[model samples]
Target: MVLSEGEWQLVLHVWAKVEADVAGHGQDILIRLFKSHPETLEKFDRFKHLKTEAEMKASEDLKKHGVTVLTGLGAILKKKGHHEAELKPLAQSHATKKIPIKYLEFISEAIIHVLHSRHPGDFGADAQGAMNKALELFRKDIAAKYKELGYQG
Candidate 1:
């Protein structure tokens, strides 16, 4: 998708807010993801047993993993043009596990959901669309690497 300048600005602005408290933001997004898509938990051994939000939040491993994802995304945001360079390695690493591309989309949706819920009136449709588009691009790049690695599962 061709992201408009407005979209880019909106995405960057929202991401800046998220970056302010990376661990908190990541934890909230993960909580939203788990709440909406419990199936996602099955993919993470560390979080699979987490049945409650309080339990998940209190887990050091979950907090660390969530922060790690935010940190990677922050790096990708800073580099901008090197999305493939950043995501390809992640795809290759996950290729052996054969994670479906839908999970990527699901995570994007979860992030958008969190954004909307957290900001309420502040996260307008344009902002939501911008984030969705940005994440789609990121996921597509990663998915390409997965396909190239012969992982269609």
Candidate 2:
């Protein structure tokens, strides 16, 4: 649940490049999420209608939520590590919605796609390793939070 200093630096450095796209690129994450895991739409009434990639990319709600998604990530990365307590309330809302943990993994996958394509130089194997560590920690914490709310399924 802890990242070495070097791991922290690598993740934050890549995040610096990503926050520049805070206004827009986050949608790429959402868009990719649905594209790769279309079955996930079963969990999202807000997005189930975004059938095609074109429609998903063009989504206005998706756009804002995309920013929200990255904003959430920024908050987590700002913590450097151990985001469990910080993410508690956030996970409560998601638990209330009965969202599955699989979607979180899909979102992480989308983030990886966005990171590698948008910042190729910074997202090499080692940097990806750092990002992976942070995101893995994030997903694990959220899963525990969901279970705490009685939705371990």
Candidate 3:
């Protein structure tokens, strides 16, 4: 899907917040994720009850990957004639875990929180269009993954 500029900004904005949240409240975020979205827990190893240390550890890994991708994309965005090819691996990785689009939205909320922390400079206001485009691309990429997996919309 062709993403608009607004969606792109939304993606970047949410990514920044998720990175910050995991860095600051890693365990708490995982706990809340499990509590709020039990279906996602199905994606994790089935040994833990509630949010165990292992769960937090997995979340840390997720955060680390998220930051790496965003930082790399930030660099790409700064370059001339750069392609958003980096997004392919990202969406593919997410599909491997069967991550629901809803969970992605929740993660976006976490990212939005981080943006709010930067007082007097809201990403939603400053780069809203780009963020939306990023989000649209993300969804598109994931949808493509499903198609590659032989699933139809």
Candidate 4:
């Protein structure tokens, strides 16, 4: 996604809120994912059987991993579109686990869902479109990195 300076700033604005509540928001993202796709939680042994947000948030491992994922995402956004180095290792790691590209799509959807739930008035159509584009680019990059690893399934 080629965002204009203004659009980039807008995206950053959205992220600033996420940064403010990184742990909470990050956990919320996972909560949304689990709620939307119950099977997803099974992928993480630590979060297995967590049927509620409170349950997941209470688990130390879940909290730590959630923060880790959110922090990595923050780092990627900080680099703007220049995230190949950061994404490659993550893609390789996840690829080894055979994580499908569809999971990435679910994650993007969960993020937007969480953001919209938090700031419904702020995320208008334009803002939503920008986020969608940015996430699409991010997903494509991760898929590219996975393919680069010669893991075609």
Candidate 5:
């Protein structure tokens, strides 16, 4: 789903706000992900033993990794049309963890949720549509990588 020029503008507009506090927004995204899908935490050995939301909330590890992920996402989005090239290695890195491909779906959902919820005034339906279009490319590109690595599951 190649984004239209208007869609790209919308995405970048939203991205500007997100990257302004990438660490803060990224950490909150992870928190939202865990809250919505507690089982997703099982994939992260670094924090899998965490049994409570409060514990996860306090951990610097989540902040660190979430920042890492969002930083990576910035690079991917910056390149825009070259997403597949970037996502290939990204997917390969995660594949080593035996991460199921479906987790991408959850993470995207969390991202969209955070964007709209945090800035309801700015992130309107049109912006949300643009974001969804943008993430669809990411999902498709990474799913291709999973296929190449025999991790289509």
Candidate 6:
């Protein structure tokens, strides 16, 4: 919403992917997608609170799937010949989820912010490029996996 041009571009790409892979009750898929990027946990509220054993297991399970989806999609996108441009459909799928646009931006920003804070510098071309490039890679991986599963990614 209030993102820079470059930042908004990344957000738009990510949102599209969100829509495609996490539509409906795609909570399982979303959880799996972010699992690999444990750092991504800094962006979500519900992810950190797990009181029961089942909830804790579920949390780990979700994180695992998240990692797979993110990494897989980025690989898929790369093999498909696009950098990360094709990740839009994934985000578009979430358009109906009623997730606020600002929230989406917040998610991306949080990831970048955390990475920057943790590294304090040298996060691969500084925070901006590091964040953007990593997200691009994630798009490619998820897209690759999506296509393998016979999904129209």
Q: Name the best candidate (by lDDT).
A: 5
Cα RMSDs, all models:
1.6, 1.4, 5.5, 1.6, 1.3, 11.8
Positional deviation of residue 89's Cα in model 3 after best superposition, in angstroms: 2.4
| Model 6 vs. true fold: TM | 0.37
Q: Could you give candidate 4's per-residue lDDT for residues 32-95 as a string of tens digits?
A: 8888988877777677867777787787777777789889887887777788888887888888
Residues 26-54 of candidate 2 have per-residue lDDT tens digits of 87888888889888886788888898888
Q: lDDT by residue for model 1 over 39-149, one digit each (tens)?
A: 889988778989999998897887888899888876775545357778777787778866688888777887888888877776898898878878877887887778788
Q: After best superposition, candidate 2 residue 58: deviation in angstroms?
A: 1.7
- What's model 2's lDDT at 96? 81
What's the TM for model 4? 0.91
Model 1: weakest 10-residue lDDT segment is 74-83
| Pick by lDDT: 3 or 5, better one | 5
lDDT, candidate 6, residue 84? 42
State every prediction's TM-score relative to the real structure.
0.90, 0.93, 0.52, 0.91, 0.94, 0.37
Kindly give the stretch of ten consecutive residues in candidate 3 with the minimal lDDT sum: 75-84
Ranking by lDDT: 5, 2, 4, 1, 3, 6
lDDT of each: 0.80, 0.84, 0.51, 0.81, 0.85, 0.45
Give residue 149's lDDT in candidate 6 (0 to 100): 47
Better of 4 and 6 by TM-score: 4
Residue 43 alpha-carbon offset, candidate 5, angstroms? 1.9
